[PDB]
Curated annotation (Swiss-Prot), chain B:
<protein>
    <recommendedName>
        <fullName>Bifunctional 3'-phosphoadenosine 5'-phosphosulfate synthase 1</fullName>
        <ecNumber>2.7.7.4</ecNumber>
        <ecNumber>2.7.1.25</ecNumber>
    </recommendedName>
</protein>
<feature type="binding site">
    <location>
        <position position="68"/>
    </location>
    <ligand>
        <name>adenosine 5'-phosphosulfate</name>
    </ligand>
</feature>
<feature type="binding site">
    <location>
        <begin position="99"/>
        <end position="100"/>
    </location>
    <ligand>
        <name>adenosine 5'-phosphosulfate</name>
    </ligand>
</feature>
<dbReference type="InterPro" id="IPR002650">
    <property type="entry name" value="Sulphate_adenylyltransferase"/>
</dbReference>
<dbReference type="InterPro" id="IPR015947">
    <property type="entry name" value="PUA-like_sf"/>
</dbReference>
<dbReference type="Pfam" id="PF14306">
    <property type="entry name" value="PUA_2"/>
</dbReference>
<feature type="binding site">
    <location>
        <position position="151"/>
    </location>
    <ligand>
        <name>ATP 1</name>
    </ligand>
</feature>
<dbReference type="InterPro" id="IPR014729">
    <property type="entry name" value="Rossmann-like_a/b/a_fold"/>
</dbReference>
<keyword id="KW-0067">ATP-binding</keyword>
<dbReference type="Pfam" id="PF01747">
    <property type="entry name" value="ATP-sulfurylase"/>
</dbReference>
<dbReference type="GO" id="GO:0050428">
    <property type="term" value="P:3'-phosphoadenosine 5'-phosphosulfate biosynthetic process"/>
</dbReference>
<feature type="region of interest" description="Sulfate adenylyltransferase">
    <location>
        <begin position="173"/>
        <end position="563"/>
    </location>
</feature>
<dbReference type="InterPro" id="IPR024951">
    <property type="entry name" value="Sulfurylase_cat_dom"/>
</dbReference>
<feature type="binding site">
    <location>
        <position position="146"/>
    </location>
    <ligand>
        <name>ATP 1</name>
    </ligand>
</feature>
<feature type="binding site">
    <location>
        <begin position="29"/>
        <end position="34"/>
    </location>
    <ligand>
        <name>ATP 1</name>
    </ligand>
</feature>
<dbReference type="InterPro" id="IPR025980">
    <property type="entry name" value="ATP-Sase_PUA-like_dom"/>
</dbReference>
<dbReference type="GO" id="GO:0005634">
    <property type="term" value="C:nucleus"/>
</dbReference>
Length: 590, 563
């Protein structure tokens, strides 16, 4: 015969043998039918073939010749157990749904399974006899109280409670979802049902109560000195923004990311940018072989990377695939080109909590802290606005028009996550402190409402990789609990350093995002280019037949106006936000 | 309870509900046992969950309390039939192997099935020597007089007829040829249309498309498809399927402007109208980005990138209706099988597994080793008639590669020498241009073969690579092709069979897998070294290449030298 290992490559789409028997037992009306039906449905919605033995298929086929007097009752269970073991042998999750009141009959069913190395999960669907009588789902209790059913178990027979059930379901204190979840978690604990890849936040910080230990432990390890952009990726990871990574990407994750823009093990997860740690040939030969090493920023041990692996940093290829150009003078590519030729993946345990002592640590909320913030505000929708530039009223418009659309849909407490990036940025961008003072100003003028707006800083470095990057911007906000992701023209783009043309076609980030896999809990809210409209004296959506009506105001014109001592047109930006920028531009010329 | 249709979607890996019972009956123990065991292996080898009820799992279990009384035996057969019913209900092919001598009982078993709307196939294993021969069995297996595999084939054919086993569950090929009954009208209509001249590489991609290798594209990629392809290596709309290379048509600004607005236009190659492209859309090429994402470099001297860089700034997608059957009239057309002709070929040869070997170079015995070991692997896993699709690429190749005609002559010599077995090998030309994009292109090599019905796809070292024209180092990391392919999405109906690098073992005098400890037992002979050796009138070591095949290459290199 074909082995269990091989029958399981072909039973279902999920690999690996998982035949077993989930043996429900309890009083008439305790919940067995209802649990097995909901379990079966879960299993089938998750790709795991199963089959249920119950009163409707056993009693009138195989067991039709069995009456009620007690040797028949014993034989009934025995036959059910033998059939179930056969189903389990065949690679199915067999669910059985019979009162099965006697301990001896159920231990026998367990032993027929265990003697054949098939898992047997005895699930006691436990509700008091009075409750099951109350329910009297099929009117059998009312018919027993007045004769003409037998030793109806609970009344004229006994029900013998299992002594060591794999699970007890207290159906008078829990709901059907509680039941199904408790059973599914059992089956996951026991490797019958796999744990799919998830976006549920996963911090890589060691628990506070394990901290001091981990620090001591970190002291005994060899060490690798990291730089500030790295430390900032250490924070992206620590806080969960790259959930479910367990650390810097291993080879297999890096290659998935570069070719498919997704992690694929255990389900499709969007992750389009490498999150890697680099190393020179010298650091590799030093650390290669150790099972753990510490990462050291500004002479402090900030994280431990366990079970590391070293693989090549094929830099030209990485760059080409991530940015769609290998141009040496792209400012993030320039840094990648100066890194080592090795990458290191492993499981990252981050130690002290990351704080930059710079005056802005109050805005650097983790995804958990943000989710908590959204619930504390009782939002029923969260829209996110990634950005790296001062907010002008073209951005504000996209935020204002999304807030509108969510009102018109029915939401009654939309919250805006105004989410500037604070990780590394290229030289000629507006420094983070400036931009935050600038958005504070925009909020003080009420262009965005401070009572419905959370302002926090996204710790990722900025890569300037367009349609590749904007998936990362988007997914990061989905992790933090955004339900809606606002995207306009050329997101994450910049001019090509050699040609001066746009590196990326401006509609690409949005088109790509609207069809990118793994972006399941959010909706993409895309917008056309907005620009100062000179006729209507406000920011508006650009229109082609009407070219003369619109002023495009670049970071470069603004810097010019600020020197000349002038102002952009009224309604381009909030006057106090402008003032912040004049103060910015003043220090810049020095 | 979840319905049959829904249980049918999760039970196995092929989709469609196919619960039924194959009820063997007859005296011969070995006949029943050999048939059930082999049918079981076949079903599992082909992705169909099944389960056998026989003495070894019923007698001492479910029926352990039944003996030989006429009543016990009847009950014995009743219980097995009800259980079989439950497996068939669960979506499995249930095979039961019991003498079941009595018409009454077999007939009852059938009614338990037929009354629950489950197919029941009574198979009389008839091997003459109060058994009651079935009056109208679905099948008669003469097991004493036909071998096991023909018997199993008989059952499998019956299951195909009755829609349990798929006649064919490769990905359905979508040709883009206009059907032979509409061609004349379609060529007349093409005559009325504007025209866009295309070159020969284009006309090869027209062929890729026509013949269905890029299923489910309906023609040259529209923007959406191009973006999915470059970012995700897959088409996504209505299902994820692997497609990692752009399949596109380029155009100049001048041709875009002439043609933008037209709802259809003809493609013209050597003065002939070869295709119509309908409802075209024009979008920006973006050559540097395309090149970077597709090849992992923008190096201007990579020989396909160099062609992409001389094409126009526009791409044109649309619905492609290919007219005349593409034929090249160079003497190799007999090998240019479409995916539909290949599937039919594999049927005619009664394959029960197809292993594909993509290549673009002369076959040496390292390549052969991969094929031979694959063939071993398939036999060991239960396949009885594995067929090798030897599938040289025949579209554009770079300047110093061995020309296609010489390669086909070389491979005919390899098969003439028995290094691969001509009787279990189909030799056909894959019509794609070769891009030399390594791990990106290897997915395209693999998906193309999937559409042609390959069940297993062999991949080795540095598939689809080449030296970086600047450094001469490998453009791609040499393990990446395999690693990426083994995990690539959208290639669900075949299996990847990856191999480590093979090389000439001096000690053993044969091609073998390389070993780091043993570095110096291994000679690596490149195409370069082959050419040098020919020029000085030497041969490679014995066992590296079939002799007749080497001789073809000397003829090739000789014709170079005349040049
Ligand atoms: N958490 C629970 N799990 C299962 N059933 C529950 C639960 N809470 C209430 N019930 C109800 O209890 C009754 C159980 O009936 P049923 O499943 O047929 O019991 P059994 O099959 O054990 O005779 C149903 O009406 C069901 O909705
Ligand atoms: N003026 C514009 N009109 C429409 N959308 C815009 C405009 N300017 C910026 N956007 C969009 O607003 C956000 C702009 O943020 P911006 O700070 O430059 O940084 P980035 O796009 O790098 O994240 C993105 O969604 C981007 O597409
Ligand atoms: N010496 C070798 N050892 C192992 N695999 C090899 C070897 N040479 C080539 N291969 C593999 O053999 C197949 C054919 O190689 P080749 O004809 O050179 O073309 P390409 O790899 O472009 O398809 C590919 O799977 C390739 O990885």
């Amino acid at each position: 015969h074909v082995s269990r290992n091989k029958r399981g490559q072909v039973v279902g789409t999920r690999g690996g043998f998982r035949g077993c028997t989930v043996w429900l037992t309890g009083l008439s009306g305790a919940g067995k039918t209802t649990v097995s039906m909901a379990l079966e449905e879960y299993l089938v919605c998750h790709g795991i073939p199963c089959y249920t033995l119950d009163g409707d298929n056993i009693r009138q086929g195989l067991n039709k010749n069995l009456g009620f007097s007690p040797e028949d009752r014993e034989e009934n269970v025995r036959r059910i157990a033998e059939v179930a073991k056969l189903f389990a042998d065949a690679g199915l999750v067999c669910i059985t749904s019979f009162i099965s009141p006697y301990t001896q009959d159920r231990n026998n069913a367990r032993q027929i399974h265990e003697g054949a190395s098939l898992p047997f999960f005895e699930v006691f669907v436990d509700a008091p006899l009075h409750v099951c009588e109350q329910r009297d789902v099929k009117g059998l209790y009312k018919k027993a109280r007045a004769g003409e059913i037998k030793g109806f178990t609970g009344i004229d027979s006994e029900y013998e409670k299992p002594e060591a059930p794999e699970l007890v379901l207290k159906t008078d204190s829990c709901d059907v979802n509680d039941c199904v979840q408790q059973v599914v978690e059992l089956l996951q604990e026991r490797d019958i049902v796999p744990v799919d890849a998830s976006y549920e936040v996963k911090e890589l910080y060691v628990p506070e109560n394990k901290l001091h230990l981990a620090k001591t432990d970190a002291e005994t390890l060899p060490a690798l000195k990291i730089n500030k952009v790295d430390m900032q990726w250490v924070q992206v990871l620590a806080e969960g923004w790259a959930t479910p990574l367990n650390g810097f990407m291993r080879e297999r994750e890096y290659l998935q990311c570069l070719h498919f823009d997704c992690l694929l093990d255990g389900g499709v997860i969007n992750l389009s940018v490498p999150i890697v740690l680099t190393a020179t040939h010298e650091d590799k030969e030093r650390l290669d072989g150790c099972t753990a090493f510490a990462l050291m920023y500004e002479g402090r041990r900030v994280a431990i990377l366990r079970n590391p692996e070293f693989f090549e940093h094929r830099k030209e290829e990485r760059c080409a695939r991530q940015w769609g150009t290998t141009c040496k003078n792209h400012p993030y590519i320039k840094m990648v080109m100066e890194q080592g030729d090795w990458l290191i993946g492993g499981d990252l345990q981050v130690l002290d909590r990351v704080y930059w002592n710079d005056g802005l640590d109050q805005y650097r909320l983790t995804p958990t802290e943000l989710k908590q913030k959204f619930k504390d505000m009782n939002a029923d929708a969260v829209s996110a606005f990634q950005l790296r530039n001062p907010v002008h009223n073209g951005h504000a418009l996209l935020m204002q028009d999304t807030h509108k659309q969510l009102l018109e849909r029915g939401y009654r407490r939309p919250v805006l996550l105004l989410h500037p990036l604070g990780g590394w940025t290229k030289d000629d961008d507006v420094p983070l402190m400036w931009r935050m003072k600038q958005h504070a100003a925009v909020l003080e003028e009420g262009v965005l409402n401070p009572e419905t707006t959370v302002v926090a800083i996204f710790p990722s470095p900025m890569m300037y990789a367009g349609p590749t990057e904007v998936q990362w911007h988007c997914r990061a906000r989905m992790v933090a609990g955004a339900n809606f992701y606002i995207v306009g023209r050329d997101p994450a783009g910049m001019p090509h350093p050699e040609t001066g043309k746009d590196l990326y076609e401006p509609s690409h980030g949005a088109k790509v995002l609207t069809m990118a896999p793994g972006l399941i809990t959010l909706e993409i809210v895309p917008f056309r280019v907005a620009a100062y409209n000179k006729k209507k004296k406000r920011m508006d959506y650009y229109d082609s037949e009407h070219h003369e009506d619109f002023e495009f105001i670049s970071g470069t014109r603004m810097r010019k106006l600020a020197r000349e001592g002038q102002k952009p047109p009224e309604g381009f930006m909030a006057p106090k936000a402008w003032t912040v920028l004049t103060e910015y531009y003043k220090s810049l010329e020095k």
